[PDB]
Protein backbone atom coordinates (compact mmCIF):
# COMPACT_ATOMS: atom_id res chain seq x y z
CA UNK A 1 0.00 0.00 0.00
CA UNK A 2 1.16 3.56 -0.74
CA UNK A 3 0.66 6.33 1.87
CA UNK A 4 -1.53 9.29 0.70
CA UNK A 5 -1.08 12.97 1.67
CA UNK A 6 -3.61 14.57 4.08
CA UNK A 7 -6.21 16.74 2.29
CA UNK A 8 -6.43 20.42 3.07
CA UNK A 9 -8.34 23.30 1.38
CA UNK A 10 -6.62 24.58 -1.86
CA UNK A 11 -3.99 21.74 -2.05
Amino acid at each position, epitope marked *: *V*E*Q*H*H*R*R*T*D*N*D
Partner: antibody
Amino acid sequence: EVQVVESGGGLVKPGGSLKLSCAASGFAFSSYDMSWVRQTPEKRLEWVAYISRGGGYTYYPDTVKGRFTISRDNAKNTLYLQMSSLKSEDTAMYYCSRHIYYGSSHYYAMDYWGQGTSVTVSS
Amino acid sequence: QLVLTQSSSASFSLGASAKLTCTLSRQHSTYTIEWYQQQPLKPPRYVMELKKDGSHSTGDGIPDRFSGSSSGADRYLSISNIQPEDEAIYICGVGDTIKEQFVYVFGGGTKVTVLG
Protein backbone atom coordinates in the same frame (compact mmCIF):
# COMPACT_ATOMS: atom_id res chain seq x y z
CA GLU B 1 5.41 32.31 20.96
CA VAL B 2 3.17 29.53 19.67
CA GLN B 3 0.31 28.92 22.08
CA VAL B 4 -2.67 26.59 21.95
CA VAL B 5 -4.73 26.72 25.17
CA GLU B 6 -7.56 24.17 25.70
CA SER B 7 -10.52 24.83 28.06
CA GLY B 8 -13.92 23.36 28.81
CA GLY B 9 -13.03 20.06 30.41
CA GLY B 10 -14.99 18.91 33.46
CA LEU B 11 -17.11 16.11 34.96
CA VAL B 12 -20.16 15.04 32.92
CA LYS B 13 -22.60 12.20 33.49
CA PRO B 14 -22.84 9.39 30.87
CA GLY B 15 -25.22 10.34 28.04
CA GLY B 16 -24.27 13.99 28.75
CA SER B 17 -22.47 16.43 26.56
CA LEU B 18 -19.64 18.96 26.68
CA LYS B 19 -17.97 21.49 24.46
CA LEU B 20 -14.19 22.06 24.38
CA SER B 21 -12.40 25.20 22.95
CA CYS B 22 -8.84 25.78 21.99
CA ALA B 23 -7.53 29.39 21.72
CA ALA B 24 -4.50 29.66 19.42
CA SER B 25 -1.97 32.48 19.35
CA GLY B 26 1.51 33.27 18.08
CA PHE B 27 1.13 31.77 14.58
CA ALA B 28 -1.16 32.30 11.64
CA PHE B 29 -4.02 29.95 12.75
CA SER B 30 -6.03 30.05 9.46
CA SER B 31 -2.96 28.61 7.59
CA TYR B 32 -3.09 25.37 9.63
CA ASP B 33 -5.01 22.18 9.82
CA MET B 34 -5.84 21.18 13.44
CA SER B 35 -6.76 17.91 15.36
CA TRP B 36 -7.91 16.83 18.80
CA VAL B 37 -6.05 13.89 20.27
CA ARG B 38 -7.00 12.28 23.61
CA GLN B 39 -4.95 10.40 26.14
CA THR B 40 -6.47 7.73 28.40
CA PRO B 41 -5.68 7.52 32.14
CA GLU B 42 -3.42 4.53 31.15
CA LYS B 43 -1.47 6.88 28.78
CA ARG B 44 -2.52 5.58 25.38
CA LEU B 45 -2.92 8.39 22.77
CA GLU B 46 -5.88 8.28 20.34
CA TRP B 47 -6.61 10.75 17.43
CA VAL B 48 -10.27 11.82 17.63
CA ALA B 49 -10.95 14.67 15.06
CA TYR B 50 -9.35 16.63 12.25
CA ILE B 51 -10.31 19.91 10.60
CA SER B 52 -8.56 21.60 7.65
CA ARG B 53 -7.35 25.26 7.67
CA GLY B 54 -10.42 26.57 5.81
CA GLY B 55 -12.86 24.00 7.28
CA GLY B 56 -13.61 22.05 4.08
CA TYR B 57 -12.39 18.65 5.44
CA THR B 58 -13.39 17.13 8.76
CA TYR B 59 -12.80 13.46 9.73
CA TYR B 60 -13.35 11.29 12.89
CA PRO B 61 -12.40 7.71 13.81
CA ASP B 62 -15.24 5.13 14.23
CA THR B 63 -15.08 5.35 18.08
CA VAL B 64 -16.49 8.90 18.07
CA LYS B 65 -18.16 9.19 14.62
CA GLY B 66 -21.73 10.59 15.08
CA ARG B 67 -21.07 11.85 18.65
CA PHE B 68 -18.25 14.37 18.25
CA THR B 69 -18.20 17.48 15.96
CA ILE B 70 -15.02 19.42 15.34
CA SER B 71 -15.28 23.10 14.12
CA ARG B 72 -13.23 26.32 14.03
CA ASP B 73 -13.69 30.02 13.96
CA ASN B 74 -10.76 31.65 12.11
CA ALA B 75 -12.11 35.13 12.92
CA LYS B 76 -11.40 34.33 16.59
CA ASN B 77 -8.45 31.98 16.07
CA THR B 78 -10.42 29.24 17.98
CA LEU B 79 -10.94 25.47 17.44
CA TYR B 80 -13.92 23.61 19.12
CA LEU B 81 -14.93 19.97 19.84
CA GLN B 82 -18.58 19.42 20.58
CA MET B 83 -19.04 16.01 22.37
CA SER B 84 -22.37 14.44 22.98
CA SER B 85 -23.77 11.06 24.07
CA LEU B 86 -20.70 10.82 26.28
CA LYS B 87 -19.55 7.45 27.59
CA SER B 88 -17.43 6.60 30.69
CA GLU B 89 -14.59 5.47 28.31
CA ASP B 90 -14.44 8.97 26.84
CA THR B 91 -12.71 9.94 30.17
CA ALA B 92 -9.33 11.24 28.98
CA MET B 93 -7.04 14.31 28.77
CA TYR B 94 -7.96 16.20 25.57
CA TYR B 95 -5.24 17.96 23.54
CA CYS B 96 -5.60 20.40 20.71
CA SER B 97 -2.72 19.78 18.21
CA ARG B 98 -1.45 21.69 15.18
CA HIS B 99 -0.43 19.79 12.08
CA ILE B 100 2.89 20.72 10.54
CA TYR B 101 2.53 23.48 7.94
CA TYR B 102 1.40 21.82 4.71
CA GLY B 103 4.21 23.49 2.75
CA SER B 104 6.68 21.70 5.08
CA SER B 105 5.03 18.27 4.87
CA HIS B 106 1.89 17.04 3.15
CA TYR B 107 1.81 14.08 5.64
CA TYR B 108 0.53 13.95 9.22
CA ALA B 109 2.97 15.24 11.92
CA MET B 110 1.49 17.16 14.86
CA ASP B 111 4.16 19.77 15.57
CA TYR B 112 2.62 21.60 18.55
CA TRP B 113 0.27 20.37 21.28
CA GLY B 114 -1.50 22.25 24.08
CA GLN B 115 -1.27 21.41 27.78
CA GLY B 116 -4.62 19.59 27.54
CA THR B 117 -8.00 19.85 29.21
CA SER B 118 -9.21 16.95 31.44
CA VAL B 119 -12.61 15.24 30.79
CA THR B 120 -14.24 12.80 33.25
CA VAL B 121 -17.47 11.02 32.26
CA SER B 122 -18.74 9.21 35.34
CA SER B 123 -21.83 8.52 37.38
CA GLN C 1 -4.59 -2.88 9.10
CA LEU C 2 -2.12 0.05 9.78
CA VAL C 3 -0.15 -0.86 12.91
CA LEU C 4 2.80 0.58 14.86
CA THR C 5 4.66 -1.80 17.21
CA GLN C 6 7.12 -0.64 19.85
CA SER C 7 8.53 -2.21 23.09
CA SER C 8 6.88 -0.92 26.20
CA SER C 9 10.17 -0.08 27.98
CA ALA C 10 13.98 0.36 27.46
CA SER C 11 16.82 1.51 29.78
CA PHE C 12 20.23 2.95 28.88
CA SER C 13 23.17 4.18 30.89
CA LEU C 14 23.64 7.91 31.26
CA GLY C 15 26.00 9.00 28.48
CA ALA C 16 25.34 5.94 26.33
CA SER C 17 24.03 5.89 22.81
CA ALA C 18 20.46 4.69 22.74
CA LYS C 19 18.29 3.41 19.80
CA LEU C 20 14.50 2.85 19.77
CA THR C 21 12.58 0.78 17.29
CA CYS C 22 9.16 1.40 15.88
CA THR C 23 7.92 -1.20 13.32
CA LEU C 24 5.27 -0.64 10.58
CA SER C 25 2.76 -3.27 9.47
CA ARG C 26 4.17 -5.10 6.42
CA GLN C 27 1.82 -3.61 3.79
CA HIS C 28 2.75 -0.04 5.05
CA SER C 29 6.44 -0.64 5.28
CA THR C 30 7.21 2.41 3.09
CA TYR C 31 5.31 5.01 5.29
CA THR C 32 6.61 8.35 6.63
CA ILE C 33 6.19 8.37 10.40
CA GLU C 34 6.74 10.77 13.33
CA TRP C 35 8.32 10.45 16.75
CA TYR C 36 6.92 12.24 19.84
CA GLN C 37 8.46 12.56 23.36
CA GLN C 38 6.30 12.84 26.45
CA GLN C 39 8.09 13.81 29.62
CA PRO C 40 6.37 13.52 32.97
CA LEU C 41 3.60 16.08 33.63
CA LYS C 42 3.83 17.43 30.03
CA PRO C 43 2.00 17.08 26.72
CA PRO C 44 3.67 15.13 23.88
CA ARG C 45 6.41 17.09 22.04
CA TYR C 46 7.17 16.60 18.33
CA VAL C 47 10.64 15.14 17.84
CA MET C 48 10.93 14.46 14.11
CA GLU C 49 9.27 13.27 10.95
CA LEU C 50 11.06 10.21 9.53
CA LYS C 51 10.95 8.74 5.96
CA LYS C 52 11.49 5.18 4.56
CA ASP C 53 14.97 6.23 3.37
CA GLY C 54 16.10 7.40 6.81
CA SER C 55 15.99 11.12 6.02
CA HIS C 56 14.27 13.17 8.68
CA SER C 57 13.38 16.57 9.89
CA THR C 58 13.47 17.40 13.56
CA GLY C 59 11.09 19.61 15.48
CA ASP C 60 11.85 22.98 17.14
CA GLY C 61 14.27 22.88 20.08
CA ILE C 62 15.25 19.20 19.69
CA PRO C 63 19.00 18.73 20.58
CA ASP C 64 21.46 17.60 17.87
CA ARG C 65 21.74 14.36 19.91
CA PHE C 66 18.48 13.07 18.35
CA SER C 67 18.51 11.48 14.94
CA GLY C 68 16.51 9.02 12.81
CA SER C 69 17.03 6.15 10.40
CA SER C 70 15.12 3.34 8.78
CA SER C 71 15.41 -0.26 7.60
CA GLY C 72 12.49 -1.84 5.77
CA ALA C 73 9.46 -1.56 8.02
CA ASP C 74 11.59 -0.44 10.99
CA ARG C 75 11.95 3.19 12.00
CA TYR C 76 14.62 4.16 14.54
CA LEU C 77 15.09 7.01 16.91
CA SER C 78 18.72 7.31 18.01
CA ILE C 79 19.93 9.44 20.99
CA SER C 80 23.63 9.96 21.38
CA ASN C 81 24.99 10.73 24.85
CA ILE C 82 21.76 10.01 26.58
CA GLN C 83 20.99 12.67 29.25
CA PRO C 84 18.79 12.53 32.32
CA GLU C 85 16.24 14.80 30.55
CA ASP C 86 15.80 12.16 27.76
CA GLU C 87 13.90 10.07 30.39
CA ALA C 88 10.45 10.02 28.82
CA ILE C 89 7.92 8.00 26.91
CA TYR C 90 8.65 7.87 23.17
CA ILE C 91 5.64 7.32 20.89
CA CYS C 92 5.58 6.90 17.14
CA GLY C 93 2.65 8.06 15.07
CA VAL C 94 1.56 7.49 11.46
CA GLY C 95 -1.16 8.80 9.22
CA ASP C 96 -2.93 7.88 5.99
CA THR C 97 -6.02 8.73 4.05
CA ILE C 98 -7.70 5.53 2.81
CA LYS C 99 -10.76 5.76 0.62
CA GLU C 100 -11.05 9.45 1.65
CA GLN C 101 -11.10 8.53 5.34
CA PHE C 102 -8.28 10.10 7.36
CA VAL C 103 -6.69 7.69 9.90
CA TYR C 104 -4.04 8.31 12.50
CA VAL C 105 -2.36 5.54 14.49
CA PHE C 106 -0.10 5.76 17.59
CA GLY C 107 2.34 3.14 18.85
CA GLY C 108 1.90 1.95 22.43
CA GLY C 109 4.92 4.03 23.53
CA THR C 110 8.33 3.04 24.85
CA LYS C 111 8.98 4.14 28.41
CA VAL C 112 12.67 5.06 28.59
CA THR C 113 14.88 4.97 31.78
CA VAL C 114 18.32 6.53 32.10
CA LEU C 115 20.37 4.37 34.56
CA GLY C 116 23.49 5.39 36.36
